[PDB]
Amino acid sequence: AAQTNAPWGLARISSTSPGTSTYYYDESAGQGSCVYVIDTGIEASHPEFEGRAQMVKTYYYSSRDGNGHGTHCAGTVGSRTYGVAKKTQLFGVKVLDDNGSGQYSTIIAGMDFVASDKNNRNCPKGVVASLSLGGGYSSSVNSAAARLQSSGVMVAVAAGNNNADARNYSPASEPSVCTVGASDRYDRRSSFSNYGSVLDIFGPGTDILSTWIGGSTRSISGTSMATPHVAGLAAYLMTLGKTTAASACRYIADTANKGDLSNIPFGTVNLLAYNNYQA
Numbered sequence: 362a363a364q365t366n367a368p369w370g371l372a373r374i375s376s377t378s379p380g381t382s383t384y385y386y387d388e389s390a391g392q393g394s395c396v397y398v399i400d401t402g403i404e405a406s407h408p409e410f411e412g413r414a415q416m417v418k419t420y421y422y423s424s425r426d427g428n429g430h431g432t433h434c435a436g437t438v439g440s441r442t443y444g445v446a447k448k449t450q451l452f453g454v455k456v457l458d459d460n461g462s463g464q465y466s467t468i469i470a471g472m473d474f475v476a477s478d479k480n481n482r483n484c485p486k487g488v489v490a491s492l493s494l495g496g497g498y499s500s501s502v503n504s505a506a507a508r509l510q511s512s513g514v515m516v517a518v519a520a521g522n523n524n525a526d527a528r529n530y531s532p533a534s535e536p537s538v539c540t541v542g543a544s545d546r547y548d549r550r551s552s553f554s555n556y557g558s559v560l561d562i563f564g565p566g567t568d569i570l571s572t573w574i575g576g577s578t579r580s581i582s583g584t585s586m587a588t589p590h591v592a593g594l595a596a597y598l599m600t601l602g603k604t605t606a607a608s609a610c611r612y613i614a615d616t617a618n619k620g621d622l623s624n625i626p627f628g629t630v631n632l633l634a635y636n637n638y639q640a
């Protein structure tokens with residue numbers, strides 16, 4: 362399948378070269394997989410989600426996304442126009458309030474929730490969790506991310522936006538999850554992207570168009586935007602049977618475009634997520 366005039370990040374993940382604008386992908390499109398977006402919520406009524414999104418948990422007085430960040434990330438995972446895996450099921454877990462803030466205790470509870478809740482959901486092709494959030498190092502936060510991964514969920518986490526080594530951030534620094542840095546449309550490391558040996562992969566993160574609250578769209582930047590590209594890619598590859606939740610991060614690294622990014626610090630992987638789709 363081909364989506365013409367796609368957002369640059371979708372085109373990038375299906376291309377061996379920067380500078381193209383069509384997204385190519387197998388029409389299975391993540392059908393039968395599920396992606397949990399652990400964030401500020403998801404505006405599930407957005408036409409772009411086509412009934413495939415739903416809120417399943419909140420820790421606040423409402424399950425509504427009053428911020429937009431979670432809706433944007435969910436859109437990059439799985440919206441019809443802006444999403445990598447256009448037929449996946451999206452589940453919202455609101456661990457962040459409408460200012461984008463959340464206590465580590467709440468974030469941990471949300472991860473443990475997903476590890477159990479996937480057993481209440483029909484996801485025969487596999488389960489992914491996208492965590493576009495984090496803060497300073499916490500062994501308890503890292504352990505929660507490790508538990509979620511061990512339970513059989515592909516966990517993709519944002520590296521962070523401090524232009525610093527991700528070893529000092531959580532859950533970014535948990536080795537067993539998939540830690541995602543950000544790149545731009547010219548194949549440069551995004552100016553704000555964290556780096557370091559704990560990174561597994563880069564995805565598009567500068568100037569990413571996706572869904573927003575109020576039934577709208579906008580372009581924003583962050584490792585938060587790169588992470589759902591990788592989460593959606595994992596769901597897509599799991600639906601194709603090419604990999605599993607336990608192996609998808611390694612598979613994405615194995616099949617990535619290698620050596621193509623600039624301003625990668627020595628010791629950080631030079632790997633850009635790539636779907637390897639051949640029509």
Ligand SMILES: Cc1oc2ncn(CCCN(C)C)c(=N)c2c1C
Nearest residue numbers: 428429430460461462581582583585
């Ligand atoms: C106008 C705008 O509104 C935003 N809300 C959340 N974010 C994401 C930053 C923090 N996040 C965890 C809540 C934005 N980057 C953003 C931008 C730009």
Ligand SMILES: Cc1oc2ncn(CCCN(C)C)c(=N)c2c1C
Nearest residue numbers: 493494495496519520521530583585
């Ligand atoms: C380790 C980590 O530390 C963070 N601090 C703020 N944010 C919010 C910035 C979100 N983005 C859209 C600009 C994070 N997403 C984050 C992550 C991951």
